[PDB]
Every structure is written in C-alpha cells, then in structure tokens.
C-alpha cells in the first residue's frame, strides 16, 4: 500500500536552483525501480556500479534523492573523475558512487517569452568544495588586499548571477532537469527494496 512518492519528486512545478539543491531521505518502502524507463520519455539514463537488472533484487536500507536544473551542455560534468565550474563550486560528486543520474529536457514548461531570471548559480569562491555539503548564504567577495568596504567598487564583487532563457535558442543551451539517486552502506536491518 505504501509506495515511495516518486511522483512527487518527478512531477513538481518548481525546481530548486543549483546552489541550493534539495535532499530527501527515503525509508520503509516497496518501490518500483523499473517504472522509470517506461514512465516517460527520458533522454538520458546512466548509472554506476550496479546494472539495471539488479536494482529490484538487491535490497537496501535508505535512499537519497536530489534534483536541480542545469543547462544542456553541462550534463557531462555530473560524473566521478570530472572537473569544471559546477563540479568545483556548486555540486561536488565523491570518488565512489553507487547511484544513478537522470536528465530530461523541460524547455516548454519554464521558458516563457519574457524569460526565467529566477534560477541562479555561483561563479566566485575562495577554495574547492568538500564532498556533500550545501550552502545558501551569499555575501561580498573581495579580490584585493584592502579590506572590503560596504560599497562594492573596483575590487569587490557580487558572487551570484542568473540565467536567461528564450524558446528560440539552439539545442545545446536549452534548460534541462537533473535528478540524482544515491545509496548508502548499511548495518541496520534493511527496509527499502523491490516488490514481488
């Protein structure tokens, strides 16, 4: 009777920005892991460690789910062993990973005529990102020896900048929605795995 609310994650009108991504714990389920492929046309489906057939057989305790929105070309940056702008200051992926990544186009829903300036991303930072933490606070960023005054002038920046979307760009710059699944090593008795 109790199935994981995968519909809630997959069907949500508003998606979180890249620098503040959602994490949702999943426990005490029997969940159709095979419903995804026939759920809706998905442009990309790539996972690591375990082949698609062994998900409903092997049995896990807890599940982690994340979701955000990125432009088209930077899908490849979400993978172990890769570096870049997002991979270093926005969302860092650890060396080991047993989850899957699903990315699908959502060009029609969000990008209206005027555009979407709600989404944001971070460009400047002082050091690399540790694996698996989340940041929301934003403040002045200085690039000079002199301490920053209240006014950000000629040496002080605004670290955050937004996107702009129109229906008539090319294929590569159209928006995409990304959902990352994850798994965790266990010592408590398992609770979430496939139906019979």
């Amino acid at each position, epitope marked *: 009777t109790n199935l994981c609310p995968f519909d809630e994650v997959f069907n949500a009108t508003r998606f979180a920005s890249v620098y503040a991504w959602n994490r949702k714990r999943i426990s005490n389920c029997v969940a159709d892991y095979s419903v995804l492929y026939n759920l809706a046309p998905f442009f990309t489906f790539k996972c690591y460690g375990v082949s698609p057939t062994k998900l409903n057989d092997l049995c896990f305790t807890n599940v982690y789910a994340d979701s955000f929105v990125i432009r088209g070309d930077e899908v490849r940056q979400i993978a172990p062993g890769q570096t870049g702008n997002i991979a270093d200051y926005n969302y860092k992926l650890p060396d080991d990973f047993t989850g899957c990544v699903i990315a699908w186009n959502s060009n029609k829903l969000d990008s209206k005529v005027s555009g979407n300036y709600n989404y944001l991303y971070r460009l400047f930072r*002082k050091s690399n990102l540790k694996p698996f933490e989340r940041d929301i606070s934003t403040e002045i960023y200085q690039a000079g020896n002199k301490p920053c005054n209240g006014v950000a002038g000629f040496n002080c920046y605004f670290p955050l900048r937004s996107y702009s979307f129109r229906p008539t760009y090319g*294929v590569g710059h159209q928006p995409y929605r990304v959902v990352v699944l994850s798994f965790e090593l266990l010592h408590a008795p398992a609770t979430v795995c496939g139906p019979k």
Partner: antibody
Amino acid sequence: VQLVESGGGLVQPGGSLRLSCAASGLTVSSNYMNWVRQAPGKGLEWVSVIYPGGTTYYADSVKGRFTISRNTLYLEMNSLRPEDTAVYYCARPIYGGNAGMDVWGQGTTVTVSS
Amino acid sequence: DIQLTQSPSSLSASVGDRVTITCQASQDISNYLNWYQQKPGKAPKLLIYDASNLETGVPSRFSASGSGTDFTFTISSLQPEDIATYYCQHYDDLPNLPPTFGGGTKV
C-alpha cells in the same frame, strides 16, 4: 592596479626556461590568471588559464609540456620546440558583468640562438 | 570546435562613412562576444564585452548590437586618430569549447 613581468631571452632547444610574471598589487591567490602569446605578424593565441582553486586547462598545441605556478605567477618550459617564439602576455580576463576587469602586461622576448 | 572568419581585413575609407565588420560562428555560440580594440605595439583593451552592451568610459561613436551566431559591428565615422585593428573573441574556458581569436581587420 598594475602588472609587472620579467625574464626571457637567449636559450637553446632541449633546455627548459622559466618565465617569472611576478605580479605586484594584485592578489594572485584568487584570480583567473591567463597566458596569451602574440606571434610576429600573425594572430593571437591562447595558452593556459588557472582557477582560484587548483585547476589547469591547456590548449591543443601545447600538449602536456607547459606548467603554470600560482603573490607571483610563474611559467615553465620543457624541451622547447623550434616553433615557439614571440611576445607573451599575462592576462586577467573579464568574468561576470562588471567593468574594469581587463589588465595586461607590457611584453617579453624569447629566441633560440647559439 | 568553433571556427571564426571575418570580413575583408584591408579596409580603408574616407572620413564620415560607416565601416562594417562581420563575425561568423561555426558551432552555435550565444552572445559570447567581445571586441578587443588593439593598436600596434600595445596590448589590446576591451571595448565591447557582452553583445549589445558597451563598455562605459568611451563616447558613443560605435554602433554594436546583435545576437544569434552572426554579429555585425559598425563605425559611423572614422576619425584619423581612431585608426586601429579590431578583433573578434569568444570568451569561455569550459571543456566543450575553448576560446579562440579571429583573423583581425586593419582599418
């Protein structure tokens, strides 16, 4: 703001060389330093760039042979090929929407003689 | 990757006549456009940094506005003191496309 460069001159092929783009008055620790070279009577080129964190991206021609070191900026050579000469430039290119980013060096020289 | 070509470089004309330069793109760039005005013997200085928007600090004697993958830049009139060479530039460092410089035109 101001940038200063030094070093460069006679050298033999097969022997490395060291370029000291010693910056003054600019925080080299956290800035997108960039290297671009201007061939004689030809178009400009791009060589390498550095992020505030440890990260290096290289152009096609200079394959695994250049090294950039982060209050000074350093560049090093390795088995300098015959097809390499002309002026080099330390750049801090514009990033973001603010105005006034771009600052450039004066110049340098290099030649393979004997 | 992206390959850039430009209008005929050797352009010389009398004062008061607009001069037009065209920059073309190969792999669908989007408004990633700079115009590095340059002078012989000196390092280039930024003049146009994001498509239509102009750098503040220079009198508005240059007409530049566009989008897509083909861009145009125009000078309403060329004073003798303003003779120089102008380049085209796509700024980025992402792994997909590296930055490149154009052929360059001498006015």
